[PDB]
Ligand binder design. Structure first.
Ligand code: WGQ
Length: 133
């Protein structure tokens, strides 16, 4: 019953500072342009201890399945090969990605009827807001 409030189908409705976040991560020009246009749907489901987060967009489709606290391999939409660990901290899903000596943290939380995604790379934050589809 952990992540019940996250489960569902969500559509991107707003994004702030995402180009600067992608720059800080190392995403190249063309990917930033095309990725920045996309309006993904995020589909979150839970089956036992396994959480699945799917992103479907015109840019890329991605899918991760994981158990909280248990590291896994992830291929990001920008084609990084990262080692990811996702935990629940005070009701917030906290997703750390490690690659090439770098790290980024993505937090996902419920706020009113929205699902808010905060992506941080060093001093740079981007906020992406999703509503139920
Ligand atoms: C998962 C975190 C942010 N995100 C992305 C994303 C993440 C990394 C690189 C790229 Cl190109 C896109 N697409 N939709 C969201 S929300």
């Amino acid at each position: 019953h952990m992540c019940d409030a996250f489960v569902g189908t969500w559509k991107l409705v707003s994004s702030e500072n995402f180009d600067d976040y992608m720059k800080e991560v190392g995403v190249g020009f063309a990917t930033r342009k095309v990725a920045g246009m996309a309006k993904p749907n995020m589909i979150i489901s839970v089956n036992g201890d396994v959480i699945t987060i799917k992103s479907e967009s015109t840019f890329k489709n991605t899918e991760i399945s994981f158990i909280l606290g248990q590291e896994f391999d992830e291929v990001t939409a920008d084609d990084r090969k990262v080692k990811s660990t996702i935990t629940l901290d005070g009701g917030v899903l906290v997703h750390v990605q490690k690659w090439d000596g770098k790290s980024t943290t993505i937090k996902r939380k419920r706020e009113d009827d929205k699902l808010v995604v905060e992506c941080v790379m060093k001093g740079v934050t981007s906020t992406r807001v999703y509503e139920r589809a």
